[PDB]
């Protein structure tokens, strides 16, 4: 009645102190651990990040241009889908971030992903039911303050919101989406009618019995895709199969809810999975029954997992423990001393401790090896790169 609503705080003042002191120590250690570390505080936290595939080294400049696809998270005010332009300094204060474009968006951006075949086409997941599609070359350079959201395409099929989003790298226009409605929708944005901005799901997969958390196309076989849900099950589907309620394979992947999955860009067989049981599981398509390996070290739920686009044996995972772990499969099962075994398994390459809140997403840079961008719930975004000294002898 008298007391105000406080969206800060709103924090745990005890945990805050611990987090901050661990951050101070991390910061003075950065010169040892990183060849590059850049930080920026966004006005609103971003739940999503993805590098655009374009890079350029402008003549006469001592840096390189890179682009990020970001989003906004406000429940009170106007949301935007944003493409940021960044200067990453040449290896031979530091750095710069700017806005290439900013697009009026209804509700927060749960996830934003670009179409590999046409990088200026971007799909987004809304707090509503529709997933949206924007062509950013057809939107004004600066957004209208009125806040009107005019997506180039609205895709219908879901009853609730979601996060899982995946373009097909081999089938242009084919998009997958996961949702809290227990389903996984499929669209072909090339077909539909002549007008206007509304297309229907081509398929609605109902194999799951709970909130399906993530979805991903196979990077090599254009008809296979994986799904992951709160029923603790990893399912693998086939599009040319005429049954949308029973997958080709069904796996009891974790003891808790499964949050994310990522196919290896080099091996057509292996797959990784992140769960609420604080572990990442390795999977091979030949035999799903056998869980190849289990990555232990995360102290809390894992929400994102991504393979390196340069090194086939490199894996990264982030979660609620505010840490981003980098794994090297080539060091699995390898022997180690007792003092080293106390820090974690041999495949644990690197623990990124620059974030002071949950990491919502991260993205491997496709043009600069070992460069990553991660975003946390406390408005921070970090573009960083592990010290060469650590991965290369």
């Amino acid at each position: 009645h008298m007391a105000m609503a406080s969206k800060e705080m709103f924090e745990d003042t005890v945990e805050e102190r611990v987090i901050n002191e661990e951050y101070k120590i991390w910061k003075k250690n950065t010169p040892f651990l990183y060849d590059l570390v850049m930080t920026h505080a966004l006005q609103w936290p971003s739940l999503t990040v993805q590098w655009l595939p374009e890079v350029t080294k402008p003549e006469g400049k001592d840096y390189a241009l890179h682009w990020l696809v970001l989003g906004t998270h406000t429940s009170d005010e106007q949301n935007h889908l944003v493409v940021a332009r960044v200067h990453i300094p040449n290896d031979d204060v530091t750095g710069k971030i700017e806005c290439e474009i900013k697009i009026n968006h209804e509700g927060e951006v749960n996830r934003a992903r670009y179409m590999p075949q046409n990088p200026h086409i971007i799909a987004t997941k809304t707090p509503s039911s529709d997933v949206l599609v924007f062509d950013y070359t057809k939107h004004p350079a600066k957004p209208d303050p009125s806040g009107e959201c005019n997506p180039d395409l609205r895709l219908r099929g879901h009853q609730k919101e979601g996060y899982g989003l995946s373009w097909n790298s081999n089938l242009s226009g084919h998009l997958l989406s996961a949702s809290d409605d227990h389903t996984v929708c499929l669209w072909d944005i090339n077909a539909g009618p002549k007008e206007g901005k509304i297309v229907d799901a081509k398929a609605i997969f109902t194999g799951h019995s709970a909130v399906v958390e993530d979805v991903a196309w196979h990077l090599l076989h254009e008809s296979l895709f994986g799904s992951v849900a709160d029923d603790q099950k990893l399912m693998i589907w086939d599009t040319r199969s005429n049954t949308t309620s029973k997958p080709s394979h069904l796996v009891d992947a974790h003891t808790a809810e499964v949050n994310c999955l990522s196919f290896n860009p080099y091996s057509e067989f292996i797959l990784a999975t992140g769960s609420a049981d604080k572990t990442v599981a390795l999977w091979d398509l030949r035999n799903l029954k056998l869980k190849l390996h289990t990555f232990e070290s995360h102290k809390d739920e894992i929400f994102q997992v991504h393979w390196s686009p340069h090194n086939e044996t490199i894996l990264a995972s982030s979660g609620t423990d505010r840490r981003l772990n980098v794994w090297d499969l080539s060091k699995i099962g390898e022997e180690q001393s007792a003092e080293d075994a106390e820090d974690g398994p041999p495949e644990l390459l690197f623990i990124h401790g620059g974030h002071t809140a949950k990491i919502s997403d991260f993205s491997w840079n496709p043009n600069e090896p070992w460069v990553i961008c991660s975003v946390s719930e406390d408005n921070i975004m970090q573009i960083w790169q592990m010290a060469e000294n650590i991965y290369n002898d």
Binding site: E22, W26, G344, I390
Partner: peptide
């Protein structure tokens, strides 16, 4: 031996402790 070889195990340990 060289000095990098001396600080390689130290840095790699620091990396796995965050």
């Amino acid at each position: 031996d060289n000095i990098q070889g001396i600080t390689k195990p130290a840095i790699r340990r620091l990396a796995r402790r965050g």
